Amino acid sequence: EEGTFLFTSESVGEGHPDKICDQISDAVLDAHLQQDPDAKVACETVAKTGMILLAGEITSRAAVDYQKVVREAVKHIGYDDSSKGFDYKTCNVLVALEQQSPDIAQGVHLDRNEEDIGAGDQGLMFGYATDETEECMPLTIVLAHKLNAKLAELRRNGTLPWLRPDSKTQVTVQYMQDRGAVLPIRVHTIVISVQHDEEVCLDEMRDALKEKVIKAVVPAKYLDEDTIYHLQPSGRFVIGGPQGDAGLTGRKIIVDTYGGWGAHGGGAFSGKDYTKVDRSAAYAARWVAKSLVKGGLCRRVLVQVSYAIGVSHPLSISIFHYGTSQKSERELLEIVKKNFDLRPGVIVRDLDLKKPIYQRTAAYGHFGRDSFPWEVPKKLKY
Amino acid sequence: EEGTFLFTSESVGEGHPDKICDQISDAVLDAHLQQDPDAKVACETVAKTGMILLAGEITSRAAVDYQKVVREAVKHIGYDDSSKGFDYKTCNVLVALEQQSPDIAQGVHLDRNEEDIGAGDQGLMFGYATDETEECMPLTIVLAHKLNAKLAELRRNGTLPWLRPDSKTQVTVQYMQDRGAVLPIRVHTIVISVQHDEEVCLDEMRDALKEKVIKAVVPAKYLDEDTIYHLQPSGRFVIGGPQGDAGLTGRKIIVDTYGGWGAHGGGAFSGKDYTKVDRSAAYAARWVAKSLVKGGLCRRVLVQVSYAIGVSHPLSISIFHYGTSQKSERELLEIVKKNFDLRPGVIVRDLDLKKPIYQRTAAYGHFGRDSFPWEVPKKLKY
Ligand SMILES: CC(C)n1ncc2c(C(=O)Nc3ccc4nn(C)cc4c3)cc(C3CC3)nc21
Ligand SMILES: CC(C)n1ncc2c(C(=O)Nc3ccc4nn(C)cc4c3)cc(C3CC3)nc21
Ligand SMILES: C[S@@+](CC[C@H](N)C(=O)[O-])C[C@H]1O[C@@H](n2cnc3c(N)ncnc32)[C@H](O)[C@@H]1O
Ligand SMILES: C[S@@+](CC[C@H](N)C(=O)[O-])C[C@H]1O[C@@H](n2cnc3c(N)ncnc32)[C@H](O)[C@@H]1O
Ligand SMILES: [Cl-]
Ligand SMILES: [Cl-]
Ligand SMILES: [Cl-]
Ligand SMILES: [Cl-]
Ligand SMILES: [Cl-]
Ligand SMILES: [Cl-]
Ligand SMILES: [Cl-]
Ligand SMILES: [Cl-]
Structure with a gap:
């Protein structure tokens, strides 16, 4: 059909080595904020075979046991034995x-x-919101996240005990163009790669990924005889986590945000206190975008902001509504200026960004779940 | 004026700690490709006070002196003394x-x-191209890059000997909407932060950044009495490079690409051989986008591609022309399918991606300069 297009988004599991680093960075941030709400934290994590390295800058009144914080984060992810390629008990920190x-x-x-x-x-x-889901997120990234969450669920409840924590998913949706908004039609392609034990055979894994993971996550109305399935497409994924691939903080910034939809300014979220606008201003921009869509001013919207080091007020604010508002982009910009103060010292108050809730953000995306403050739309006066 | 909007892009200098890591990662890649064109390279770099760490996976017939490759890259960047906060001669590798x-x-x-x-x-x-410059790049990112190149030039020629290698720039342009294409009107705001010595005063630096850097780079027709200048806005930047801020490979992916324009799939370029589609497919997508614009089929275009591990052919291809073609997005997609083969094993031949030219890509952006193979448009048959 004319007026249709494909869009692909990916997500990763909690045991993906880059995502391990994000969760550890935010575990360290939370440990500091628990004792010192004004902790200045710039904590990078690096993960390779047998190693977590913390690198960066922290000025804090907190007394933090880095050995305990790092190992507890790795334990939660599920790397607890040499058989899985990584062990919180015996790794180097x-x-x-x-x-x-x-x-x-x-x-x-x-x-x-x-x-x-x-x-x-x-x-x-950038902040982005789309009316294509209730949570104002692209369906592609929502489904990709949920497939990784389902793998972690079936690993943790013991129904697929051959699963290991390292996973990646990818969802291609066929969309209909609708006056600058987008309508999901069908799922075109799904990829699932997940680390596994030496006992389970490829056919058992592929059957389980289709029947217990995909059918448990993706509504049947989106799946058809033409849907393409790439399940364990490498054929073997026993070596995984940091052993398979070096991980770094802030190397999943598109997984963390909109799955390639909207736009990205390049900044990593994890390991950073609210004074780092890479995080606070991105949360605030999501909050503005979601407020515009939930306020019924547009079906789809992108907000850009920018800053200079040492300067409170944004240098630039820009609104792009994809033609999905009766109001001009200028009128929406004036509504944003009347309703929001995007100084980091005000965002911290509005979004409660001294609260140690950051490790919760560092898997399954920072947006579209758990009614975090930036997901609760502001009532707009205009 | 109605129909105008602001857009901000940033760039960083060769001594920015994240960019140090990108250049080292690509120095290591080039060293391998010089001896083994089929080297499998996944080299992450981490930079903090006194430390370069290499982490990742390399399978290669090459004999590479990592100490020599790393230190020579740091020497070229200009970190050659403890006074500058980092020294290739005496740092830990x-x-x-x-x-x-x-x-x-x-x-x-x-x-x-x-x-x-x-x-x-x-x-x-994603690949992106825009007719707003001859090199088919956004003016915002081009100017931001050139401001960092100008700082490195005036440091290396000794005209501003107080300059150190670590810098960041940011350019906000006011654009006119033109039937889905964009026309630059004026430069709204410039930020320059650059590491400096203990002798030079803030007023000398700000005067020099305006008169010797900005006026030497940004055409006067874009600058006016209302243009905002944030020059050394922190007030002091003596501590810099890895000492000031931990660096990691692949933490400048937006600086590396379109400065927030177009779109990004999340993949880092540096330290990766051609089999990593994060690099090869992004270069190929730029090549397709630039071929469509230089072929006169559109003024502005975005290409999305996606892959599954172990699968040659892209899972999805998508064309978004911003309403700047007479041809439908479907017709442009058919032209791309007729003219391009986006298997990584074909891209490597078309773009000569076994050639050790990667360290050259790892500063000032991967696109819009030096007529790299992906910047030479393909003549399209249709
Ligand atoms: C910058 C990236 C993430 N980005 N941002 C938007 C899009 C679209 C897109 O929105 N296309 C539409 C949607 C609705 C429509 N209504 N009408 C009348 C025309 C329309 C066109 C498409 C792609 C594909 C991947 C290249 N990327 C986009
Ligand atoms: C996804 C991001 C990078 N992205 N991609 C495009 C834009 C535009 C944009 O192209 N706006 C235009 C341009 C030309 C026009 N002609 N007509 C008739 C209407 C138009 C609107 C704007 C922003 C600002 C930063 C929010 N972001 C964009
Ligand atoms: C394919 S690895 C990246 C390339 C790797 N650094 C190399 O040396 O080629 C990227 C991610 O894919 C996943 N992965 C690791 N081993 C895999 C395998 N055998 N099959 C499929 N996916 C795998 C993990 O999530 C890993 O972080
Ligand atoms: C501001 S630092 C990031 C925050 C830092 N990790 C912290 O602990 O707060 C990011 C980049 O800004 C630049 N930078 C470092 N020190 C600076 C200073 N004093 N003034 C301005 N920019 C600086 C460097 O390019 C550095 O990589
Ligand atoms: Cl990856
Ligand atoms: Cl979820
Ligand atoms: Cl990777
Ligand atoms: Cl409206
Ligand atoms: Cl930075
Ligand atoms: Cl340049
Ligand atoms: Cl940073
Ligand atoms: Cl045309």
Whole structure:
């Protein structure tokens, strides 16, 4: 049919080595915020065979047991034995952490009123919302996330005990163009790759991934005789987690956001306190986009903001409504300016960004779940 | 004026700690390809005070002196003394490199005809082109890159000897909407932050950044009395490079591509051989997008592709022309299918991706310069 197109998004499981790093970075952030709500945290994680390395800058009054925080995060993910390729009990935890650069500290937050704190860096950030789901997220990324959540569920409840924590999923949806909005028609292609034990055969895994994972997640109305299934397409995935592939914090920024929809400014979320606008301004921009769609001002919208290090107010704000509003982009920009204050020192109050809830964000995407403050739309006056 | 909007892009200098990691990762890739054109390389770099760590997976017949390759890359960037916060002569180089997972190797390339090699991973990748510049790149990212190149030029020629290698730039352009294409009107805001010595005062630096950097890069026709300048907005940037901020490979993926324009699938380029579609398919998608614009089929275009690990052919191809073609998106998709083969085993031939030219790509963006093979448009038959 004319007016239709394919769009592909991916997601990864909690044991994906990049996602291990995100969760550890946010476990460290949460440990600091639990004792010091004003902790300055820039914690990068690196994961390879037998190694978690923490690298970065933390200035905090907190007393944090990095060995305990890191190992407890790896335990939760499910890497608890050499047979699985990684073990929280016996892995190396290396720490290369120093205080925040005093040059950054003096430029950003020292002797500044909290509301008037400088952005922790320059950068650009986008928020996106789409009416194609209730949670205002693209169906492609929602389904990809849910397939990884289903794998973790069936691993943890023991129904597929051959599963290991490292997984990736990919969903291609055929969409109908609808006056600048998008309507999902069908699932065109699904990929699932998941780490597994040496006992289970490829046919058992492929049958289980179709019958127990895909059918348990993707509504039958989206699946048909033409839907393509790439299930364990590598043929073998015994070696996995950090052993199979080095992981780093902030290497899943598209999985973390909109699955390639909307736009991205390049900033990583995990391991960063609210003064890092890479996180706080991206959460705020999601909040603005979702408020515009839930407020009925547009079906689809993209918000861009940008900052300079040491400057409170955004340098630029931009609204792109994909032709899905009766109001002009200028009118929507004026509504945003009347209703939102995107200084990081105000966002922290509105979104409660000193609360140690960050490890919860670091798998299955930061947006479209659990009614986090940035997912509760603001009632707009105009 | 109605029909106008702001768009912001950033770039970073060669000494930005994330960009140090990209250049080292690609220095390592090039060293392998110089001896073994079929080297399988997945080299992550981590940079913090006094440390370069290599982490990842390399299977290669090459004999590579990692100490020499890493230190020569850091020397070229200009970190050659403790006074600058980092020194190629005396820094720690740690190596955590293993062979490629045999499970990946058997699934992707072992006993496979080169043309029919599997994608090295699943994933999605985008190519973008815009007629707003001759090189088919957004003006925002082009200017941001050139400001960092100008800083490196004036550091290396000794005209601003107080400059250090770590820099960031950000350019906001006011655009006119033109039937789905974009026309730059003016530069709204410029940010420049650059690491400097203890001798030079803030006023000298700000004067020099305006008169010797901005006026040397940005045409006067884009600058006016209302243009906003944030020059050394932190007030002090003596501590810099890895000492100021931990760096990782693949944490500048938006700087590497379109500066937030177009779209991104999440994949990092640097440290990866052609079998990693994160790089090869993104280069190929840029090549397709630039061929469509230079072929006169559209003013602006976005290409999405996606892959499954172990599968040669893309799972999905999608064309979005922003309403800037007389041809439908379906017709452009058919032209792409007739003219391009986006198997990684064919892209490697068309774009010469075994050639050790990758360190050249790892600063100032991978697209819109130096007539790399993916920047030479293909003559289209239709
Ligand atoms: C920048 C990326 C993420 N990005 N942002 C939007 C799109 C669309 C898109 O929205 N297409 C539509 C949707 C609705 C429509 N109504 N009408 C009348 C025409 C329409 C066209 C498509 C792609 C494919 C992957 C290239 N990417 C997009
Ligand atoms: C997904 C991001 C990177 N993305 N992709 C396109 C845009 C545009 C955009 O192209 N707007 C235009 C351009 C030309 C036009 N002609 N007509 C008649 C209407 C038009 C609207 C704007 C923004 C701002 C930052 C929110 N982001 C965009
Ligand atoms: C394919 S690996 C990336 C390439 C790898 N660094 C290399 O050396 O070729 C990327 C991700 O795919 C998954 N993966 C690892 N081994 C795999 C296998 N044998 N089959 C399928 N997916 C695998 C893991 O989630 C891993 O983080
Ligand atoms: C601001 S730092 C990121 C935050 C940092 N990790 C922290 O602990 O707060 C990000 C980048 O900004 C630049 N930067 C470092 N120190 C700076 C300073 N004093 N002023 C301005 N920019 C600086 C460097 O390019 C660095 O990689
Ligand atoms: Cl940065
Ligand atoms: Cl979920
Ligand atoms: Cl990877
Ligand atoms: Cl409306
Ligand atoms: Cl990956
Ligand atoms: Cl340049
Ligand atoms: Cl950063
Ligand atoms: Cl045309």
